Design a protein around this ligand. Structure first.
Ligand SMILES: CCCCc1oc2ccccc2c1C(=O)c1cc(I)c(OCCN(CC)CC)c(I)c1
Ligand SMILES: [Ca+2]
Lengths: 672, 555
């Protein structure tokens, strides 16, 4: 019946089961062998492919049965093409559409895909202008260097009429080592023979890859069908300089700038400023929703004095100096050092290891092991020293803790206030947007699978771009190659190496006689499209991360900042080993006195300003020693800014209930 | 001092420019060679130094201003160099005269203020610079611990000191990496290194330099592959891929995020004064003029057909035909294709001339030159008719044929002018031309200064290889300028750095201290490049959207 399988479909676990199945099927797709069609692994994965198709066909029928848009068409398209299986190369390439249907199964993935499409749509005015200008520059380059990039194999024949036969080549320029070679009237790989070639060459130039080679090839461009001349027309470099400045420096930075502007405008699509402004939406919220910090002042003065010795600025400075010396000694190791130098460095390593293993126990004794894990940075030193005391024994696997002991530098040197906060907020932004990274990973996966299917059979030669370290033979190697292209190292050289006329590795299955078949004309489209898509997605991720922290990037510390709130919390915890929620009022005088003038009171004596303002400003009518953490902060932030007269205090609470987020039944006391 | 107000500053500026051009026309020859032009330029420099010391002595009758301190320093340095040469390393101190173009900004408050703004913009980036330095130090230390003394085993020959590869790569340090495959080759220790010893992890300086190079995205895969040859495939990829992601991609986002925030922080500061209001006020009267000009004249002073949509589509098909005619040329094209190209050129020139003449007799001559579109079309058509008459006249014009095609290629503007949606950006960038010129001139001055410094340092010293000729050199001014531009683009800057290091003695000796020339030229060059081409794209582009929103309010 129609309503029978509806409950099964809408279950809280069926969707996750099908998502796990599609993810693991994609993983199975990413584990085949491009080289050998007949292999043990391929057959094993071949049996698996039958299982998912049976499951996915079952899913389609039941889903259709209860439902009897274009997302469902894609779901059937992926399963449909598989059933035709079981030219075949085109179908095998097309079966890469398996993880593309996971977009509909996740709300976040669908949302980020729609956001990417919307960003693409608004951009198109800039793309059209850039494409038109690049086409005009290609036409000018065609008019300039039409056929002038030809050259002979030996730099002695200047026309094809005499660039024929054999010639003697001198290896490495030595006259005593000659070798006979054939001379061929060759053409440049990136020329300006026609409009399309000019467009491709100018694209490779605009990617800032191999552009000096093209520049110095065009400088030597002499005539229509003659060889190059050394520094013939250096003045022709103006064409390349102007093209680069106009397109890559100017119209590609307008691209990113307009993306940033659009994201900023999208970030201002809501109007919650009924009376307040943005500056009040980042500090009043913190004051309303907060939590007291813990200091853990100990007892048992026999331990308290030891803790005070441990918890002091000179001790921290001494540890800083000791770690700086340790790293300075770590950096002095060089190649083929003297025996005395190595022995002295080893001895100093033992000395520093002993110092650190003493200091851990010294901190634990005065800090107790239970509270050791409370602080994030305290646990960092906890797990390093045992590694130090292990390698001192294994010295006379080994390099693990040898490498891991360097982390102390960043651990004890990130204790700043502008770099630590920057790193933390950017990591928080990265965690807040884990779906653009998923989009990038999906693009990398799809293109790596396509490259494995297409260029996987190209033989690896030590004198080419497709070598033992750069190839499409395995998925990790394909991903590494795509990462190399994304960084833009030699992607045009790889494209040239993936051209149709390439040798095939012996382990592949091909008919005897046709050794040079692997490689396709699809390489140009593959590499250009991958570069464009990867660049677009990378700048999309960058601008998303940037827009996620726009409040910090435009903090304007000259008026206010969360560091004031952090200092207030630290002062609150100074007399409070634990939160405890509420405190007395006798120490509130010192608490107010221990604030900076921008947040607390001016440098003048509190006998005039603070004393009068304490009674003048509205305070909860509690006992003489019962004041809570959620009231004094709001009172102080109201004193510093957003001051309202008595009687009309409920206006602020009405605005809070109308603008600020859910009160969670906590502002009842804050109203008074 | 009474008369020195207008002419003294102008004369000093002219003297600075003349000194700059005299430095530009100097040719550094290798191995103490020279010619007559250098001999004359020596006396020219003598006269310029005399003028400069006279001005320095006169200006006292001073030190508080930094620019005057710089002028005094360079003047006394020139005096020191001249005295040493006359009474005598000798020409090594000659590199301090490259600061003469630098003081030109003092005389140019515009350039100066721009320079002050750019310098003050660097304060928020110091924390990012410190983070980059710490990451570089940590990665260099890790490389010292891991990859120390491993790039020293290349495929050699049987009982000989000859490398068996034209492009050698390291062997396996402990039988895990790459092994010789040739029948009569074995590999042992004693090798120099991959890049002549420059790129390796067997010293703190070497490790720091190669880590910085890998962070700059240039040539990191070469180091990764050399590691893959030395050791296995599993350890090195973790070190370098993570370094690439954290070293630059994370840092590039952090650098852009701060500057984009800082630039947007200037937008909120400049909005209080009302700079955007002036642009809106100037723009809001432009549409009020077009509707009040045609109507105020057409009542008394035929034209319906020319403004019809049929005429628009006809001119569009004509420009499409012209574009197809231009973009159909290729190497070894058929002769009949050439014949069709000339026939189409003549026919379309005649048709466009007839269309222009028809428009001139039904729209008005005065209304044309008011708009920038009509005058450009007049220039294009005059250039085209001149091209045709010159081609078919008694003048061959061999080189001018290609130039004139680019003149007639610009007809696509006639159909891109009807956008009206992207024109906000065009108007804003055309109205900010003074600022655009100021930043472009500052960038050009930076490039010129560093080109002259590179000419002084590596001029003629790239003749050490003896087996090949190098194209990215500092031989003359155009070549040094091209090399500086290429380094600014960031492509193959490490190759130029390697050449400069090998020109001063290679990895051994104190010849590696010169590598800080390329580090400064890259870091301090990309920083300005990222402030000049991003300010235009953030200031005049944010205003365009604000202008669009304001225009939408009235629409
Ligand atoms: C989502 C698929 C479309 C992406 C895309 O289409 C374009 C059309 C015209 C011009 C640019 C693009 C474009 C880009 O996203 C793009 C292209 C390039 I090339 C590019 O520059 C890459 C290298 N860069 C520094 C080395 C040179 C400026 C950047 I950033 C973004
Ligand atoms: Ca590069």
């Amino acid at each position: 019946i129609r309503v029978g399988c509806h409950k099964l479909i809408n279950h809280h676990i069926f969707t996750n089961l099908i998502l796990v199945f599609i993810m693991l099927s994609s993983a199975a797709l990413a584990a085949e062998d491009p080289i050998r069609s007949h292999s043990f692994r391929n057959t094993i994965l071949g049996y698996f492919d039958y299982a998912f198709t049976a499951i996915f066909t079952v899913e389609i029928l039941l889903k259709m049965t209860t439902f009897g848009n274009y997302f469902n068409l894609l779901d059937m398209l992926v399963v449909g093409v598989s059933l035709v299986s079981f030219v075949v190369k085109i179908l095998r390439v097309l079966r890469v559409l398996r993880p593309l249907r996971a977009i509909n199964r996740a709300k976040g993935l669908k949302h980020v895909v729609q956001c990417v499409f919307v960003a693409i749509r608004t951009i198109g005015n800039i793309m059209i202008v850039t494409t038109l200008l690049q086409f005009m520059f290609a036409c000018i380059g065609v008019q300039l260097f039409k056929g002038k990039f030809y050259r002979c194999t030996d730099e002695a024949k200047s026309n094809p009429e005499e660039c024929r036969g054999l010639f003697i080549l001198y290896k490495d320029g030595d006259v005593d080592s000659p070798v006979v070679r054939e001379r061929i009237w060759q053409n440049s790989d990136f020329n300006f023979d026609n409009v399309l070639s000019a467009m491709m060459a100018l694209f490779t130039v605009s990617t800032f890859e191999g552009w000096p080679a093209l520049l110095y090839k065009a400088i030597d461009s002499n005539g229509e069908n003659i060889g190059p001349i050394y520094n013939h027309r250096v003045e022709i470099s103006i064409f390349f300089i102007i093209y680069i400045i106009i397109v890559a420096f100017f119209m590609m930075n307008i691209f990113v700038g307009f993306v940033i502007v659009t994201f900023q405008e999208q970030g201002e699509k809501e109007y919650k400023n009924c009376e307040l402004d943005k500056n009040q939406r980042q500090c009043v919220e913190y004051a309303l929703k907060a939590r007291p910090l813990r200091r853990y002042i100990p007892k048992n003065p026999y331990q308290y004095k030891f803790w005070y010795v441990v918890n002091s600025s000179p001790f921290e400075y001494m540890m800083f100096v000791l770690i700086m010396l340790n790293t300075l000694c770590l950096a002095m190791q060089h190649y083929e050092q003297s025996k005395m130098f190595n022995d002295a460095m080893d001895i100093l390593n033992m000395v520093f290891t002993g110092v650190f293993t003493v200091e851990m126990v010294l901190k634990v004794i005065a800090f107790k092991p239970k509270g050791y894990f409370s602080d994030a940075w305290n646990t960092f030193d906890s797990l390093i020293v045992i590694g130090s005391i292990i390698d001192v024994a294994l010295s006379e696997s080994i390099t693990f803790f040898r490498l891991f002991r360097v982390m102390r530098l960043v651990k004890l040197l990130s204790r700043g206030e502008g770099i630590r906060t920057l790193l933390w907020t950017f990591i928080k932004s990265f965690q807040a947007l884990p779906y653009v990274a998923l989009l990038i990973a999906m693009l990398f996966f799809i293109y790596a699978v396509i490259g494995m299917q297409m260029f996987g059979k190209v033989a690896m030669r030590d004198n080419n771009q497709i070598n033992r370290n750069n190839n499409f033979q395995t998925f990790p190697q394909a991903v590494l190659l795509l990462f190399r292209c994304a960084t833009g190292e030699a992607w045009q050289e790889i494209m040239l190496a993936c051209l149709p006329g390439k040798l095939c590795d012996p382990e592949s299955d091909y008919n005897p006689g046709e050794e040079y078949t692997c490689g396709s004309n699809f390489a140009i489209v593959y590499f250009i499209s991958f570069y464009m898509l990867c660049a677009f997605l990378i700048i999309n991720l960058f601008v998303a991360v940037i827009m996620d922290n726009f409040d910090y990037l435009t903090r304007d510390w000259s008026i206010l900042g969360p560091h004031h709130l952090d200092e207030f919390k630290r002062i609150w915890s100074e007399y409070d080993p634990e939160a405890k929620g509420r405190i007395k009022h006798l120490d509130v005088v010192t608490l107010l006195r221990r604030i900076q003038p921008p947040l607390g009171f001016g440098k003048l004596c509190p006998h005039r300003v603070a004393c009068k303002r304490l009674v003048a400003m509205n305070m909860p009518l509690n006992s003489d020693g019962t004041v809570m953490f959620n009231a004094t902060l709001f009172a102080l932030v109201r004193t510093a800014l957003k001051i309202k007269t008595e009687g009309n205090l409920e206006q602020a609470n009405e605005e809070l209930r109308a603008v600020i987020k859910k009160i969670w039944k906590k502002t009842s006391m804050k109203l008074l | 001092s009474i008369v020195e107000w207008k002419p003294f500053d102008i004369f000093i500026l002219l003297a600075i420019f003349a000194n700059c051009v005299a430095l530009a026309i100097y040719i550094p020859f290798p191995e103490d060679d020279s010619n007559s032009t250098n001999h004359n330029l020596e006396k020219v420099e003598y006269a310029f130094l005399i003028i400069f010391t006279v001005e320095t002595f006169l200006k006292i009758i001073y030190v508080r201003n930094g620019w005057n301190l710089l002028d005094f320093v360079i003047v006394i340095v020139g005096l020191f160099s001249v005295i040493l040469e006359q009474l005598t390393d000798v020409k090594a101190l000659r590199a301090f005269r490259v600061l003469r173009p630098l003081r030109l900004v003092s005389g140019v408050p515009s350039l100066q203020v721009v320079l002050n703004s750019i310098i003050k913009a660097m304060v928020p980036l110091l924390h990012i610079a410190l983070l980059v330095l710490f990451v570089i130090i940590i990665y260099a230390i890790i490389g010292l611990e891991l990859f120390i003394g491993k790039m020293h085993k290349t495929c050699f020959f049987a009982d000989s000191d000859i490398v068996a590869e034209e492009d050698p790569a390291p062997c396996a340090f402990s039988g895990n990496g790459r092994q010789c495959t040739a029948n009569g080759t074995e590999c042992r220790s004693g090798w120099v290194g991959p890049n002549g010893g420059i790129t390796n992890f067997d010293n703190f300086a070497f490790a720091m330099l190669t880590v910085f190079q890998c962070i700059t995205m240039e040539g990191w895969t070469d180091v990764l592959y050399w590691m893959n040859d030395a050791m296995g495939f599993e350890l090195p990829w973790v070190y370098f891929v993570s370094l690439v992601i954290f070293g630059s991609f994370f840092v590039l986002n952090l650098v852009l995020g701060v500057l984009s925030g800082e630039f947007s922080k200037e937008r909120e500061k400049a909005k209080a004064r009302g700079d955007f209001q002036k642009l809106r006020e100037k723009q809001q009267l432009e549409e009020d003029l077009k509707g009040y000009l045609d109507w105020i004249t057409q009542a008394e002073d035929c034209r319906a057909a020319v403004k019809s949509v049929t005429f628009y589509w006809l001119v569009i098909v004509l420009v499409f035909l012209n574009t197809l005619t231009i973009s159909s040329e290729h190497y070894n094209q058929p002769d009949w294709l050439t014949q069709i190209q000339d026939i189409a050129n003549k026919v379309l020139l005649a048709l466009f001339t007839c269309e222009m003449l028809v428009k001139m007799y039904s729209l008005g001559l005065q209304a044309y030159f008011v708009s920038l579109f009509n005058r450009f079309d007049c220039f294009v058509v005059c250039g085209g008719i001149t091209e045709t008459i010159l081609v078919e006249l008694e003048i061959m014009s061999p080189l001018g044929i290609s130039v004139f095609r680019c003149v007639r290629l610009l007809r696509i503007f006639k159909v891109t002018r009807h956008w009206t949606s992207l024109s906000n950006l065009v108007a804003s960038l055309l109205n900010s031309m003074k600022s655009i010129a100021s930043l472009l001139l500052l960038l050009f001055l930076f490039i010129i200064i560093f080109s002259l410094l590179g000419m002084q340092l590596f001029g003629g010293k790239f003749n050490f290889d003896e087996t090949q000729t190098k194209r990215s050199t500092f031989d003359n001014f155009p070549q040094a300028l091209l090399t500086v531009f290429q380094i600014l683009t960031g492509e193959d800057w490490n190759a130029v750095m390697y050449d400069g290091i090998m020109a001063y003695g290679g990895p051994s000796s104190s010849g590696m201290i010169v590598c800080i020339y390329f580090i400064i030229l890259f870091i301090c060059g990309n920083y300005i490049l990222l402030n000049v081409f991003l300010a235009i794209a953030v200031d005049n582009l944010a205003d365009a959207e604000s202008l669009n929103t304001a225009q939408k309010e009235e629409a």
